[PDB]
Symmetry: C3
Subunit: 348 residues, 3 copies
């Protein structure tokens, strides 16, 4: 019974236990894959207050010495600080959490020059603004926002806004209400554009999941009266509206948003970010309650991809565009997304 | 059959496995929560000799670089050295274990001045002697005894005894035969005496379980001829009689010793310390064998609170109400201590 | 149903998950027990390509900061570098893998003097050549061989061969086609001779498992035209023919190879090394096809010693249905990794 509150809490614990027994990273335990994963752990804790989530969060923060990863120009490398900030706020204990290494990262990232800001890169991926790919909008903005809030330094939000607007102005497709992953996927309108197998624009489900899930985390903690809030609220509603509209019949979004018929089964990690962001918006009254059944159908479909031992399956491995997954494929960020969806499904 | 030797062994291993897969700490892997946990893992090893226990003990000792935690005035931060001392004795490898950080801790703890010894603290907790709260008598005394034993330096015991007597003189209720947690729970006869709803003095089950289970560990290894040994033996027998006398009908002590009716279910960690200390005393001949069925009733109750995947449940946190899913690493340690003695009965 | 491809892949994943949940070492996570274990994990990845094996390999290499253990004269302390070289080759990723600590170890191990090379030791074990005990032939040669291959430095193979020949000249019993563990077990025809309860020479199953397993790994990656290759092929063929010949009825080698009657039950870790090496050679064409049933029978007997939760049991410590070791799980994964390919 996938909608039963104890079912959902037990499924969430089992997903945590499975992933804790299978640690994984792309390049380091402090990298974006674990940052996204522990961000989901953090929200699962926020909803259930179960000590086991907080144990895992504290475990990893201590093991990593409260360090972000080390490419200071690189948004991916600060995603882990969300978990650090969350524990610092929610574990009231002196001589324990340390936010200095996060502060140091953010100061360099935001205020120091680097090759990406300088716009001197000449590659296909076009690495000529700080956040030149859409996934960055999950990795850095929610951390800068929670940092600004906890430290009472609103100026970080201004710097966040400047870079978020650059990404938005480059990659947000105003006609389709979805983000291209990077400049390669923006159309010039001719026979050399990158297209899906059915000829449509490429909009990657997890790619857009990062953005919309980043919006839900952002709006969760951004001040009510922040001077640019309306910009974020409206982007969130526009993207939510499209994602709802293109949700496949069986409830799971495919890895390709506009060419879902290219895949035989839906993909869990992008679907989990959408279900998180959607359930969040319904719970906050930003999205009409009549959308509850669509958000529940996704939840049901993802719940049925979870193995008896807790593994969250049907997750596409690391990438930058639509690719297949299978029933045993997993990743820590995919467990993280499932934990995010569950943490909001529980509040409906 | 919860009394079958093979049932108990497989239960204890599952409790270890489940806790190893769910590591936890209050402030650090070397903190008292882990020191109590791995002291239960040490005693499980000592009874069963299963290589799985010793693997887990060596893994954390090496991962922690043999260090206790860092507040050298604080008995909680040396609890972890019990496991280190146990590995140094029982893992037969020269040049593997390092007891120097434990020695550095004990020398500063016992011989150098600090603000708790100075007596100037003005808090409600009254942190005006080294071991100003009763739980400290599980954390430091058993480690100082093992250290004194392996170093053959009995002066460490004399120093242990001095501080142990301060805690006993402040907190042991000679009429009730149980310990108050700290000065706040000691009655002065005035307006803010702390009472249970039934009017009785407040004695915490796990608080007393730290003390009596610490007494069993101490007497396990203290020399038969130590000058002060009788004092610990009679303390142990007095607390044991009272703890037996107040045991609830279903086997499990509640979090409150003199007001069990304030809780709707028994609590596992305190009960496990009592069960360990009581079983140990029966096996050593300090407690009369007629008390076996009661010790056994407690083991059965706790064995039924273990989940199928090994989780030891009904453990009150360091607080949310204790529930069937609630666990702690020191609760799994206490369950392993109990099992380690039930096995030898 | 132990021969089905699926049963085999899921058994190996269970063995991995059980071992990963039960970390163990003799003295350090980078010691030989773990080197053996991760070497099985790397071969399981090589056959299956399952991302789970690679996550475990990457995890331990970063946790250990790519360091072998610390006695540079000692072959045991470099066994963990096989997994590091494996990751470096197979995880295509910049500024991630580090082979400098392995290179430093091998340069000192192979090219600098030490007390064992100097020949001054005067004990029963006779620690007077670099690799004075046969297990060292699993620990160091495969790592040297893989380092030589990835660095394009065949001079490392030449130095490997010098030390391998020493251990061969001392410890390989040419009439029995098996290795003695060290000089204590070699006969000189006096009362000091060590014998089994039945009068036979002592040949240890795991001891020999290390050698023949080492030889499969070595032959897997040594260039085909390497000038010393025939020595290694011939040795591998001789050992494999004998180990086939002495394999007990129920499929499992006992701890003692010439006195299996001194034990009630076979032992898994040694068996799993034999099974890996024998299955490897059948697959490579070095061993006759007709020996498939004998290797299949080993795999089945081993498969039946795995608990439901993945534990590989009946492994003698450094033996009972419960007894396990990390290098026993490693040997099980090695065997599986070749059985899959038959």
């Amino acid at each position: 019974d996938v909608f039963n509150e104890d079912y959902i809490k037990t499924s969430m614990i089992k997903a945590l236990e499975w992933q804790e027994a299978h640690p994984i990273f792309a390049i380091h335990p402090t990298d974006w894959t674990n940052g996204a994963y522990y961000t989901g752990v953090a929200r699962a804790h926020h909803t259930t207050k179960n000590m086991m989530y907080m144990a895992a969060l504290k475990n990893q923060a201590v093991a990593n010495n409260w360090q972000p990863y080390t490419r200071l120009y690189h948004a991916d490398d600060v995603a882990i600080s969300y978990s650090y900030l969350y524990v610092a706020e929610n574990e009231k204990r002196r001589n324990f959490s340390d936010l200095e290494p996060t502060k140091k990262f953010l100061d360099t990232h935001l205020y120091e020059d680097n090759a990406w800001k300088a716009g001197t890169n000449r590659s296909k991926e076009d690495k000529t603004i700080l956040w030149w790919w859409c996934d960055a909008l999950f990795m850095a903005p929610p951390v800068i926002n929670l940092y600004a809030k906890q430290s009472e330094q609103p100026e970080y939000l201004d710097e966040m806004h400047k870079y978020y607007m650059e990404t938005y102005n480059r990659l947000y497709d105003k006609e389709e209400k979805l983000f291209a992953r990077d400049s390669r996927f923006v159309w010039d309108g001719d026979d050399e554009d990158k297209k899906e197998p059915n000829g449509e624009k490429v909009f990657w489900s997890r790619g857009n999941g990062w953005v919309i899930g980043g919006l839900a985390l952002l709006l969760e903690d951004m001040p009510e009266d922040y001077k640019h809030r309306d910009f974020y609220v409206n982007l969130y509603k526009e993207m939510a509206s499209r994602i709802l509209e293109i949700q496949p019949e069986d409830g799971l979004w495919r890895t390709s948003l506009l060419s879902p018929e290219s895949y035989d089964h839906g993909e869990v990690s992008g679907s989990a970010f959408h279900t998180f962001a959607l359930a969040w918006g319904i719970n906050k009254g930003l999205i009409d309650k009549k959308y509850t059944p669509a958000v529940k159908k996704a939840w049901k479909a993802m719940a049925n991809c979870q193995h008896d031992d807790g593994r969250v399956g049907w997750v596409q491995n690391i990438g930058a565009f639509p690719e297949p997954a299978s029933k045993d494929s997993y990743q820590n960020f995919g467990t993280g997304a499932f934990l995010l969806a569950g943490s909001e499904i529980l509040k409906m």
